[PDB]
Design a binder for this molecule. Structure first.
Ligand SMILES: *[C@@H]1O[C@H](CO)[C@@H](O[C@@H]2O[C@H](CO)[C@@H](O[C@@H]3O[C@H](CO)[C@@H](O)[C@H](O)[C@@H]3O)[C@H](O)[C@H]2NC(C)=O)[C@H](O)[C@H]1NC(C)=O
Ligand SMILES: *[C@@H]1O[C@H](CO)[C@@H](O[C@@H]2O[C@H](CO)[C@@H](O)[C@H](O)[C@H]2NC(C)=O)[C@H](O)[C@H]1NC(C)=O
Ligand SMILES: [Cu+2]
Ligand SMILES: [Cu+2]
Ligand SMILES: [Cu+2]
Ligand SMILES: [Cu+2]
Ligand SMILES: [F-]
Length: 497
């Protein structure tokens, strides 16, 4: 029941009750999470998104981003509202027509307008590799081995009151889970395995906010992929996974036939597992249909530590092996005050004209681009370093860059940089007070690429900038279809702009 790589995708409003509490939602494909969009490496995806939304309480406009797909030459298809497009208006559709050369792994898709993805528009996106170098490590890799972790709110995203703390009401694993308060014994998700087989579990955080401590009682997990990047095998018994990150891990069904708890503990909201919150069930074929009776350890033996991960391929680190050893070394001042985030003193507020359209219309330095102070130019064919020192309230903040993955030269909670063999990924926790998480990449993808915290509430409150990569070559690199050119006039007419 995967769809794609050529598919329609309808975006609708409907009631759902994933934790036993009914609320309206914004759904792709009629479900929460949305259906898996899938294809093979190098395929042409043609996702015709039909905006059928009618309930203004969750916004009737929409725009969808394909998280972690580089969009080289198709920046117009990337999805962030007012960065690469105007939103699609209700009653209209738009074909996101792009290719995925050179990428294979676990991705996801989500609304990229306001906080709308929190209201339900989120689903997995898998690019399989027919020649996967990890293929011999497992037996099963299909829709039944995708594990999504989601935060779910009873209050609608647009209706979260100004000045009150926002926390979720349930953790949903594969779309099901129990509410933290007024808990009812609603159905839990079941992941089924066969004794003796090995599974490529594709763990996807579709969170709007919390990080999760993910584990499976009785089992360990051998990581083989990080945010689309193949890794050396790393065996862990717990994974702290931040918003928008992905891991593949091998699960060996090597425990007695039975039922085992799957645990996903968020860093906010309900703590523990009373009443079966924060839980799903791993069930072996032939086990009794009953809840697990297993317990977690008090202390995990082998938690994931990001510096333990290393690429499977020889990826190295671009630039020179010291701080500032790049063509364009940056240090961002990431701050929060009075309800707003800022980057180098500027809080992001989406512009009226999308950044890409401003560039195509001839704005040719980043000082000319709106929002003023929110768009930073990057030079072409250059090594970029971005230090992201933590400290701003609401952390740990998982920062994400569109259009690129990056070497994680320095990780959370460890002052030592790695210029030899760090993991590459696309979303990274910047850690805690005093940390200096630092990323590097090379600029080989002209266009405006969003850089932001992936806690959606923080993005909405301004925690973002746009890297206008290679402004001079953006128009030649990214020819735009007529339907894209039609988006802003249609949107602005509908909204009387
Ligand atoms: C904090 O982060 C640093 C940097 O990522 C980590 O340092 C790295 O630690 C590894 C593991 O010990 C070192 O690699 C090892 O190298 C030795 C040669 O001495 C080799 O025999 C081992 O097989 C292994 O590959 C690596 O050199 C080192 N890198 C740097 C730049 O120091 C460190 O482990 C992290 N701290 C914690 C507590 O995890
Ligand atoms: C994080 O690392 C960056 C460099 O990647 C540090 O930046 C330097 O900051 C000092 C002032 O604090 C400046 O004088 C230098 O010009 C900067 N660049 C260098 C040395 O390459 C930054 O200080 C670090 N931040 C934290 C909090 O550790
Ligand atoms: Cu994303
Ligand atoms: Cu993205
Ligand atoms: Cu944040
Ligand atoms: Cu984004
Ligand atoms: F992305």
């Amino acid at each position: 029941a995967q769809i794609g790589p050529v598919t329609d995708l309808h975006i609708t409003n409907a009631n759902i009750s994933p934790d036993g509490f009914s609320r309206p939602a914004v759904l792709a494909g009629g479900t929460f999470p949305g259906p898996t969009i899938a294809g093979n490496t190098g395929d042409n995806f043609q996702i015709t998104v039909f905006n059928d939304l009618t309930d203004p309480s969750m916004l009737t406009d929409t725009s969808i981003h394909w998280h972690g797909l580089f969009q080289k030459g198709t920046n117009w298809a990337d999805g962030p509202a007012f960065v690469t497009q105007c939103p699609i208006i209700t009653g209209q559709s738009f074909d996101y027509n792009f290719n995925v050369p050179g990428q294979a792994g676990t991705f996801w898709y989500h609304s990229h307008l306001s906080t709308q993805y929190c209201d339900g528009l989120r689903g997995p996106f898998v690019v399989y590799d027919p020649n996967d170098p990890n293929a011999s490590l497992y037996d099963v890799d299909d829709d039944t081995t995708i594990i999504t972790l989601a935060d779910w709110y009873h209050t609608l995203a647009q209706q979260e009151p100004i000045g009150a703390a926002i926390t979720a009401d349930a953790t949903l694993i594969n779309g099901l889970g129990r509410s933290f308060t007024n808990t009812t014994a609603s159905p839990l998700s079941v992941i089924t395995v066969q004794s003796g087989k090995r599974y490529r579990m594709r763990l996807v955080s579709i969170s709007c906010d919390p990080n999760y401590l993910f584990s499976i009682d009785g089992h360990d997990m051998t990581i083989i992929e990080v945010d689309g990047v193949n890794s050396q095998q790393l065996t862990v018994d717990q994974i702290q996974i931040f918003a928008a990150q992905r891991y593949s891990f091998v699960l060996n069904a090597n425990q007695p036939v039975g039922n085992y708890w799957i645990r996903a503990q968020p860093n906010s909201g309900g703590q523990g597992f009373d009443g079966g919150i924060n839980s799903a069930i791993l069930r072996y074929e032939g086990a009794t249909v009953e809840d697990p009776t297993t317990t977690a350890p008090t202390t995990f033996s082998n938690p994931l530590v990001e510096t333990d991960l290393h690429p499977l391929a020889d990826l190295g680190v671009p630039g020179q092996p010291f701080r500032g050893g790049a063509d364009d070394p940056l240090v961002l001042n990431l701050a929060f005050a009075n309800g707003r985030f800022s980057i180098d003193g500027v809080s992001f507020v989406p512009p009226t004209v999308p950044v890409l359209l401003q560039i195509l219309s001839g704005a040719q330095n980043a000082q000319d681009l709106l929002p003023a102070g929110s768009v930073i130019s990057l030079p072409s064919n250059s090594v970029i370093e971005v230090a992201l020192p933590a400290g701003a309230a609401g952390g740990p903040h998982p920062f994400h860059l569109h259009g690129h993955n990056f070497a994680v030269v320095q990780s959370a909670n460890n002052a030592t940089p790695n210029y030899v063999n760090p993991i590459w990924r696309d979303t990274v926790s910047i850690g805690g007070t005093g940390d200096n998480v630092t990323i590097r990449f090379t600029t080989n993808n002209p266009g405006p690429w969003f850089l932001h915290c992936h806690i959606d509430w923080h993005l909405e409150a301004g925690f973002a900038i746009v890297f206008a990569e290679d402004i001079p070559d953006t128009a030649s690199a990214n020819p735009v279809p007529q339907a894209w050119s039609d988006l802003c006039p249609a949107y602005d007419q509908a909204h009387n702009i």
